[PDB]
């Protein structure tokens with residue numbers, strides 16, 4: 193916090209952030225999926241809330257804002273790597289981990305900006321226990337509704353609805369390893385193996401541990417993809433405060449990513 | 457490596473069930489009024505994290521009891537007085553003109569913890585109207601406790617601390633000490649322990665952002681830990697473990713009355 197204060201000349205505000213966003217190319221009526229690091233911007237008067245109102249101010253109710261709202265805490269611990277756990281636990285976890293509930297389940301590894309956004313009124317969340325998304329504005333409903341359990345990031349997912357709407361991805365202080373849209377590139381190219389997975393859901397107002405199948409998604413290659421993608425000079429770059437940001441068409445990068453994965 | 461440590465220091469995973477046992481053996485029970493302060497990590501590894509702890513509390517207290525937690529948002533306060541991290545005066549007036557108004561369902565808390573962030577978003581959980589020192593509550597007296605908080609004297613005789621007092625309710629500390637024990641700020645108000653300062657914050661007055669100036673105590677938890685140590689000598693605090701976390705259950709009137717008397721004796 194001390195550092196963030198020191199590295200900032202004047203405070204970022206809803207107004208400054210809003211300028212920065214417009215200079216960069218965000219505009220009224222656009223569809224955008226947003227990924228962010230709050231600290232990278234520098235000190236902000238209002239933190240997470242300011243970044244959310246600024247996005248809202250620029251895009252407006254006639255535009256649409258989406259953000260990933262992933263809750264991997266709820267996943268089968270068999271496959272747990274980041275931190276791992278003893279096999280005696282596994283079956284206890286499956287039998288006791290609380291079911292997914294849109295309004296309730298916290299995100300993990302998404303950031304304060306996402307935590308703040310998902311609790312806003314009129315912001316709606318998709319129905320996936322592990323790979324949900326939240327959306328606001330004009331196509332909120334259409335984007336978040338009827339996500340399939342299997343293939344969370346596939347052709348029945350919000351990623352594809354953003355694709356069909358020819359929308360944009362915005363990266364604030366983060367690189368391609370956070371660019372969830374490229375998962376759809378994975379699916380479309382068959383980049384990863386399938387695995388049997390599970391999660392807890394409310395089936396008939398009744399907790400149930402549901403097994404189903406998904407890709408072993410891997411953002412390991414995303415950064416590489418992004419570097420080679422940017423050689424085409426189709427990404428807009430500029431600062432929000434101190435943060436290096438990026439604005440691109442989602443179709444652009446998803447299509448590049450599909451072709452890239454195949455070329456291997 | 458923290459998540460790693462927490463896992464390593466845990467024998468079997470904490471769950472809604474285990475946490476609920478521990479609460480009951482400690483003395484939490486149906487129909488009780490309780491203000492809860494916590495460190496999630498202190499418990500050890502929990503299947504479901506914050507959500508587990510929240511459900512466990514509801515499971516024990518039930519809709520016939522009441523749960524309260526502080527939902528403070530000091531981010532929104534006049535930067536003149538900022539100490540923890542400070543900011544150049546050139547900013548100060550900009551901050552007052554631009555920092556977003558408080559909104560109960562919107563404004564994140566600062567320094568309260570994941571358990572509070574999770575709690576305040578639960579349905580049926582209602583939050584008081586203060587832009588800096590709000591509280592959130594659930595169950596039988598949720599409404600009565602959180603309603604009509606005065607601007608000035610946030611933690612005073614028009615605050616939720618007092619409503620908890622009148623109800624003869626409890627304080628629960630999970631993995632945290634008396635420096636987190638917000639109730640004692642009533643003791644401060646009752647005893648006149650701190651100076652009064654002209655403060656401000658941004659509110660929605662008529663669907664309209666307004667910077668409001670008003671007056672409060674310069675509240676100081678610096679002495680709480682000392683107060684707590686001397687308080688516990690009377691042996692009226694119940695102690696026990698939730699997972700790995702050393703916990704404490706006491707009657708709020710007990711500690712607030714001791715605290716009022718303590719502060720005066722000086």
Ligand SMILES: CC(=O)SCCNC(=O)CCNC(=O)[C@H](O)C(C)(C)COP(=O)(O)OP(=O)(O)OC[C@H]1O[C@@H](n2cnc3c(N)ncnc32)[C@H](O)[C@@H]1OP(=O)(O)O
Nearest residue numbers: 227228229230231234235236239302303304366370372411
């Ligand atoms: C394959 C896939 O799809 S990947 C999943 C998609 N992922 C995403 O979209 C998330 C992408 N973002 C990231 O990965 C980021 O690196 C993060 C969020 C993980 C980490 O970024 P951070 O800035 O460290 O975290 P975050 O954005 O939550 O903001 C919190 C930090 O901002 C800082 N902060 C607090 N208040 C303020 C303020 N007023 N002004 C500026 N900074 C502040 C604090 O440092 C805080 O950290 P703390 O929680 O340790 O106090």
Ligand SMILES: CC(=O)SCCNC(=O)CCNC(=O)[C@H](O)C(C)(C)COP(=O)(O)OP(=O)(O)OC[C@H]1O[C@@H](n2cnc3c(N)ncnc32)[C@H](O)[C@@H]1OP(=O)(O)O
Nearest residue numbers: 493494495496497500501502505568569570636637638677
């Ligand atoms: C006088 C007054 O009015 S002041 C007091 C008002 N405030 C309060 O009552 C707050 C009381 N609590 C405190 O003071 C504590 O020190 C805190 C909350 C500030 C810090 O406690 P922590 O345990 O570090 O954090 P918190 O309670 O948010 O728990 C989240 C942490 O638990 C850990 N965690 C995450 N998942 C799990 C899990 N399944 N199991 C266990 N731990 C987990 C993580 O470290 C997380 O922190 P990070 O993810 O940011 O690294």
Ligand SMILES: [Cl-]
Nearest residue numbers: 222223358359
């Ligand atoms: Cl668009």
Ligand SMILES: [Cl-]
Nearest residue numbers: 646647716717
């Ligand atoms: Cl008195």
